[PDB]
Specification:
There is one protein chain. This protein is an all-alpha fold. The protein has one domain. The longest helix is centred in the middle third of the chain and has 10 residues. It starts with 5 loop residues before the first helix and ends in a 6-residue tail after the last helix. Keywords: Disulfide bond, Ion channel impairing toxin, Neurotoxin, Potassium channel impairing toxin, Secreted, Signal, Toxin.
Amino acid sequence: GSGCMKEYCAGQCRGKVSQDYCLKHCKCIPR
């Protein structure tokens, strides 16, 4: 995919940096 996919990352995780973490790591950002 594009990292992971930009579609998938907005369908699972929210906000620019959280979605950017999914673009790097195929998961949502930790707290």
